[PDB]
Design an enzyme around this catalytic site. Sequence first.
Site, mmCIF file in Angstrom:
data_model
loop_
_atom_site.group_PDB
_atom_site.id
_atom_site.type_symbol
_atom_site.label_atom_id
_atom_site.label_comp_id
_atom_site.label_asym_id
_atom_site.label_seq_id
_atom_site.Cartn_x
_atom_site.Cartn_y
_atom_site.Cartn_z
ATOM 1 N N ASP A 57 1.041 -1.270 0.134
ATOM 2 C CA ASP A 57 0.033 -0.143 0.080
ATOM 3 C C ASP A 57 0.907 1.381 0.022
ATOM 4 O O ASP A 57 1.340 1.472 1.048
ATOM 5 C CB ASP A 57 -0.726 -0.101 1.229
ATOM 6 C CG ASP A 57 -1.811 1.078 1.226
ATOM 7 O OD1 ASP A 57 -1.858 1.990 0.434
ATOM 8 O OD2 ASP A 57 -2.575 1.221 2.296
ATOM 9 N N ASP A 64 -1.349 5.654 -5.435
ATOM 10 C CA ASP A 64 -1.801 4.679 -4.428
ATOM 11 C C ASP A 64 -1.947 3.371 -4.857
ATOM 12 O O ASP A 64 -3.161 3.090 -5.689
ATOM 13 C CB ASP A 64 -2.977 5.331 -3.865
ATOM 14 C CG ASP A 64 -3.382 4.733 -2.515
ATOM 15 O OD1 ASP A 64 -2.551 3.876 -2.052
ATOM 16 O OD2 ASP A 64 -4.518 4.738 -1.951
HETATM 17 C C1 LIG Z 1 -10.259 -0.140 5.045
HETATM 18 C C2 LIG Z 1 -9.532 0.616 6.455
HETATM 19 C C3 LIG Z 1 -10.289 0.214 7.588
HETATM 20 C C4 LIG Z 1 -10.077 0.718 8.882
HETATM 21 C C5 LIG Z 1 -8.698 1.108 8.792
HETATM 22 C C6 LIG Z 1 -8.062 1.461 7.918
HETATM 23 C C7 LIG Z 1 -8.388 1.429 6.543
HETATM 24 C C8 LIG Z 1 -7.551 1.552 5.426
HETATM 25 C C9 LIG Z 1 -6.381 0.913 5.519
HETATM 26 C C10 LIG Z 1 -5.427 1.131 4.442
HETATM 27 C C11 LIG Z 1 -5.647 2.102 3.455
HETATM 28 N N1 LIG Z 1 -5.038 2.473 2.559
HETATM 29 C C12 LIG Z 1 -5.097 3.210 1.515
HETATM 30 N N2 LIG Z 1 -4.434 3.672 0.789
HETATM 31 C C13 LIG Z 1 -6.366 3.854 1.542
HETATM 32 C C14 LIG Z 1 -6.872 4.878 0.389
HETATM 33 C C15 LIG Z 1 -6.303 6.450 0.752
HETATM 34 C C16 LIG Z 1 -6.337 6.629 2.262
HETATM 35 O O1 LIG Z 1 -7.028 7.382 2.698
HETATM 36 N N3 LIG Z 1 -5.173 6.199 2.976
HETATM 37 C C17 LIG Z 1 -4.841 6.320 4.322
HETATM 38 C C18 LIG Z 1 -4.133 7.306 4.786
HETATM 39 C C19 LIG Z 1 -3.388 7.099 6.053
HETATM 40 C C20 LIG Z 1 -4.408 6.431 7.199
HETATM 41 C C21 LIG Z 1 -5.692 5.797 6.806
HETATM 42 C C22 LIG Z 1 -6.074 6.089 5.302
HETATM 43 C C23 LIG Z 1 -7.365 3.911 2.628
HETATM 44 C C24 LIG Z 1 -7.158 2.816 3.663
HETATM 45 C C25 LIG Z 1 -7.989 2.268 4.524
#
Ligand SMILES: Cc1ccccc1-c1ccc2nc(N)c(CCC(=O)NC3CCCCC3)cc2c1
Length: 367
Positions: free
Chosen positions: A34, A219
């Site tokens: 990721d 991403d």
């Molecule tokens: C599904 C989910 C359930 C509960 C806890 C977290 C997540 C989660 C986990 C990984 C992720 N990775 C990504 N690339 C994205 C899309 C972009 C984004 O908003 N990224 C992150 C920035 C850092 C902090 C979290 C969000 C979303 C994500 C969401």
Amino acid sequence: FVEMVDNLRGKSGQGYYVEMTVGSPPQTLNILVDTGSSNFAVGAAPHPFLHRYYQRQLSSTYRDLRKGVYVPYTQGKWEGELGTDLVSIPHGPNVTVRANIAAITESDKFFINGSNWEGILGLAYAEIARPDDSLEPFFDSLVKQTHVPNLFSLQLCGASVGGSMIIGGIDHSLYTGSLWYTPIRREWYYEVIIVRVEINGQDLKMDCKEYNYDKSIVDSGTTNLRLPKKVFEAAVKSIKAASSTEKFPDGFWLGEQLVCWQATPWNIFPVISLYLMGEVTNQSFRITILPQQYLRPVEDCYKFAISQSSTGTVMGAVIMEGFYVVFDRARKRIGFAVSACHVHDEFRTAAVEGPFVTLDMEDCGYN
Ligand SMILES: Cc1ccccc1-c1ccc2nc(N)c(CCC(=O)NC3CCCCC3)cc2c1
């Protein structure tokens, strides 16, 4: 790097994961790759959906940090206990490092039922690590404790997906033509500036500041090309226009419904081009995607893979799957090249082209 080729697996819509090991003796887990987060987090409890999980009690090199972490998202969350341990990547560089690990002891709408992964490897920057920027992301740790160069690359190849993550270098057989680099506007997400959007070679005619509001990112953790609201209105308007020949349920352009064909009229669909800010003042390049990138197969049926977004542009698996993407952390720049493993047709390909002249590119970001 022949060691590292084809080291990624997954299932359509379910991310790309890499085999890793944690603790001594090594415990093997499939970990999701990721470039849009910065935590290394793994299942540490027997949640029903999980094939396997991190058993700290089994590890002589485990060290507790006596410190919890909470990470919520749109829907759902994951909660864990912080710690460190010996981590290595079997089909990666030939080393083992001590890195931070969030042991997930409670989650909600995080794990996917039927998936074959058990954690997540955040490859973005400390600036978005939870709980705060002091939790050194896995890659930072690797570069510090070894001679592995500060870069990685991703060839995502597209119900069963495959790919390559080359850690610490570039493999020239994974791409064709030349690499073009856009700069990393800031080290938090992998943030880039988009300065133009064309369709079949025709400008979308918008202020460039609208392509990058409030940010644009690279991403591997997202499936769709996600454009912001305004940009998405204008972009669908033009693909629909280019494909008047056939009409489609006015919900399908929202991913709700999927269109099918016997044994698929590719030429009916436009190429999309994004111009990205280049390495040099006033200089840009452009990346071009075929329809077979934003029309992805299900189980001849297809989902429309461009989405309304509201937190910015996200160049997810739809973009990334046509290109070899180099995350040149060492030189704060991202590289794009035509992937050797993208789906062609008889008459047209995906492309990475330049240079182009673009004035006032700074004025494309938000502040
Ligand atoms: C599904 C989910 C359930 C509960 C806890 C977290 C997540 C989660 C986990 C990984 C992720 N990775 C990504 N690339 C994205 C899309 C972009 C984004 O908003 N990224 C992150 C920035 C850092 C902090 C979290 C969000 C979303 C994500 C969401």
